[PDB]
Amino acid sequence: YVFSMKDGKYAFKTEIRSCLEHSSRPTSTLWVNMMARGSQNIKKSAIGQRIIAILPYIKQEIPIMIVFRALGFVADRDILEHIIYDFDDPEMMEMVKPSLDEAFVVQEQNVALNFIGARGARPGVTKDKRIKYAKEILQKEMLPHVGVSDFCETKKAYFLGYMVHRLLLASLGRRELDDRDHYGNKRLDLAGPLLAFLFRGLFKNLMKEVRMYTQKFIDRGKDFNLELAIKTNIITDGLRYSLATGNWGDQKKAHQARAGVSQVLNRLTFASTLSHLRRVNSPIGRDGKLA
């Protein structure tokens, strides 16, 4: 998705809500942003508009060139091959200059990984673990939909270059900006994925309870019974609560859950029942002044 900001420090933003297919460790939002021109600095006037990247689990702002060097591309021609597909285009070569000028100090992969790891939450010590932590950001958090295995840095660099290419296309006006209320960019969670998410949560709770029971009965040197290990009330009670109440999550943590997902079926006319069975709800709350 590509959006434009009327107010703020960003001229344009590029957003992806990337998630691994039918898996846990939920959806991570990756941003590739352009810095706005309206920065009152003498030295930044020669710089101009600049491209940064906002990473999951990192509260700081990282330039994209350090990220590209952290994926194993020390040269600049290879990265500009990854972003600018046609070398004959003048204006995109003019737009890629300030990121290259800013990230001139970092020129090696481990230096880029140390740059990444120094800005994460709860930073490590003595560089290399941070570098290891940087790999944990660059393999499990950056774009899980393209791959979380090893040796997937090439495809991830291709997709990151495609995102920067789209951001530069939308900066120069060669493509239209994306629309939030365009319904092609929307999906409908029916009973299937929603009950699948509930079963993920309840199965994780069941595995945790079974693990605690067998860890209690394994430290005494004795064996255990599998039928006594599984507490069968967990899945049944969780599904019954989240279908009867409508609060879509844990019973103790229902404040963070969506309400009104499950509703009492309206039996007044046949048309009322058919309209209730074919209802689509928008997740926007009913207090928005925006039309």
């Binding site: 103790k252 943590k253 229902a254 404040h255």
Partner: protein, 343 residues
């Protein structure tokens, strides 16, 4: 039982009335150590940045012409007086004073009719910061070598600072010492509301569960008893600090539960505690929903239908609504026979 009644059949131990007659009477809890009142916290630092941290005197002396001009300008407006005094005391970082600090002249005879000068202790006032209810002090310029540059300030230290402020400095500070002394903003004796404020919720026969304020006061009593047991046994300093932290948390979340930066008071049923501020503040609160907008007794409400045969100063009323609604007509000799046949 000394605070009031409990059910519809009992009597008050104090005033010997029923639930309608008894207004309910207050109790008190003597805290072992003083704790901050949370809603006065934004007031309290406003006095803490105007008086000295050591000698408890004002940063600018009250015989200043600017203070006299502020007092002359703000007669009857103590809040604006506090605002102007806080603006005057915002730039003061040293407790400057001393009657012998103006000896710049040579061969000057001392004056027996001289007014007293500023009685400053010559200490640097720390910057006071806060991340919730914890209050810290930092000295950018160092005092004498026995003072650490960064300290945590307990409520007992603030209580001892605000106790030694004279009544004149309170009066220039916009707080009348007859009713509103500053050292009374730190909770040492907690009032206990009567049973009318916290009703015992009865469900089926007997009162099973109380409301949230009774459970919160139970937490208050348990934390206070734990603190006085731990200081009576002479335990370690971290145990005492943890007890003060829990007692301050319980007092503040009895008073205020919606302040950011502070952990929420976790009620049993997955909800936050509804404190006194949540009772008062709001559209459905005690002011807007119960005082400006209380429900009436003699009223009716139904669907309307047109009637062109009625004149504009008439309304058609159904017979059931007319039988339910009554009017208390006085009995006069003019209508005595008609009211007799009515009864």
């Amino acid at each position: 039982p000394r605070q009031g009644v409990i059910d519809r059949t009992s009597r008050c131990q104090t005033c010997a009335g029923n639930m309608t007659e008894c207004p309910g009477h207050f109790g008190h809890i003597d805290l072992a150590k003083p704790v901050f009142h949370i809603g006065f916290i934004t007031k309290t630092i406003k006095i803490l940045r105007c008086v000295c941290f050591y000698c408890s005197k004002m940063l600018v002396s009250p015989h200043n012409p600017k203070i006299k001009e502020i007092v002359m300008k703000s007669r009857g407006q103590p809040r604006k007086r506090l605002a102007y005094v806080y603006d005057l005391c915002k730039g003061k970082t040293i407790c400057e004073g001393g009657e012998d600090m103006d000896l710049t002249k040579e061969n000057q005879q001392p004056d027996p009719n001289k007014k007293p000068g500023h009685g400053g202790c010559g200490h640097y006032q720390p910057s006071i910061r806060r991340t919730g209810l914890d209050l810290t002090a930092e000295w950018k310029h160092q005092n004498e070598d026995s003072q650490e540059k960064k300290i945590v300030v307990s409520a007992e230290r603030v209580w001892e600072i605000l106790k030694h402020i004279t009544d004149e400095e309170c009066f220039i500070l916009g707080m009348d010492p007859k009713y509103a002394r500053p050292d009374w903003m730190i909770v040492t004796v907690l009032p206990v509301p009567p049973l009318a404020v916290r009703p015992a919720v009865v469900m089926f026969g007997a009162a099973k569960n109380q409301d949230d304020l009774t459970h919160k006061l139970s937490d208050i009593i348990k934390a206070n008893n734990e603190l006085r047991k731990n200081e009576a046994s002479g335990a370690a300093a971290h145990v005492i600090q943890e007890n003060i932290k829990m007692l301050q948390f319980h007092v503040a979340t009895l008073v205020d539960n919606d302040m950011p930066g502070m952990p929420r008071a976790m009620q049993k049923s997955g909800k936050p505690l509804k404190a006194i501020k949540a009772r008062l503040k709001g559209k459905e609160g005690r002011i807007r929903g119960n005082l400006m907008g209380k429900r009436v007794d003699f009223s009716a409400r139904t669907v309307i239908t047109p009637d062109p045969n009625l004149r504009i100063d008439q309304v058609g009323v159904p017979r059931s609504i007319a039988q339910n609604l009554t009017f208390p007509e006085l009995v006069t000799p003019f209508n005595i026979d008609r009211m007799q046949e009515l009864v």
